[PDB]
């Protein structure tokens, strides 16, 4: 997250670090958002290679033992059918992770709330983006939990030509977009939270940014519309 603040030890607890086994060591690679004690969800570039994934709840500063986290791993990645790794563009990227173990609810980790299916947030809703991700554009990541605060831009204006164009799908969601503020590398796959009728629920999971740069003025953070997928997600939870 560029532009961002640390977030409070117990303000998202839905946010999961999606981590890779680098030897004898684990990376992190993507946020998530956890939506069942054994389901997340992430973005499905995230998991294009063929790596050993475990995923982090209850995180808060990767580097250092926070004294909440529950590490379990992957036993089953669901990509979206339509996922196409050439074109991240053509959309679809969304992915489900289904947990070898059920994690402890408490505090720290929480279940996302999820909006309900076709919901579209006027434009400039209040949001939050969350995430370990680059601090600047070709940076490194943070070591603690990221948030900024992300307007959304709505689907009009975003396939705008001034901004995405066509670039940009209605199964797409844009927030930012201001040069300050955005997700960067290592936020994809995580939570875009808006608040709606007092409640916070799980909008975007991150997508992409421009190759200029992850803060760059009238290009918004992208990210998959979580409404377009609901049908989709309880399909794939009720059948594995
Ligand atoms: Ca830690």
């Given at each position: 997250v560029v532009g961002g603040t640390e977030a409070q030890?117990?303000?998202?607890?839905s946010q999961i670090s999606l981590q890779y086994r680098s030897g004898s060591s684990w990376a992190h690679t993507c946020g998530g958002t956890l939506?069942?004690?054994?389901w997340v969800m992430t973005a499905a570039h995230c998991v294009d290679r063929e790596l050993t994934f475990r995923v982090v709840v209850?995180?808060?500063?990767?580097?250092?033992?926070?004294?909440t986290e529950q590490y379990v791993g992957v036993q089953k990645i669901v990509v979206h059918?339509?996922?196409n790794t050439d074109d991240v563009?053509?959309?679809?990227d969304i992915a489900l992770l289904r947990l070898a173990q059920s994690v402890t609810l408490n505090s720290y980790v929480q279940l996302g709330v999820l909006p309900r299916a076709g919901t579209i947030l006027a434009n400039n809703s209040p949001c939050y983006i969350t995430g370990?991700?680059?601090?600047?554009?070709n940076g490194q990541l943070a070591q603690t939990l990221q948030q900024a605060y992300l307007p959304t831009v709505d689907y009009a204006i975003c396939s705008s030509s001034s901004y995405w164009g066509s670039t940009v799908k209605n199964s797409m969601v844009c927030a930012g977009g201001?040069?300050?503020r955005s997700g960067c590398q290592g936020?994809?796959?995580?939570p875009l939270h808006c608040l709606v009728n007092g409640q916070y629920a799980v909008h975007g999971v991150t997508s992409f940014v421009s190759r200029l740069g992850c803060?760059?003025?009238?290009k918004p953070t992208v990210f998959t519309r979580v409404s377009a997928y609901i049908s989709w997600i309880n399909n794939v939870i009720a059948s594995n």
């Open positions: 030890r117990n303000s998202w607890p939506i069942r004690q054994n209850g995180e808060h500063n990767l580097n250092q033992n926070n004294g059918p339509y996922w563009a053509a959309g679809y370990w991700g680059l601090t600047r554009t201001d040069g300050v936020d994809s796959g995580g803060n760059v003025t009238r």
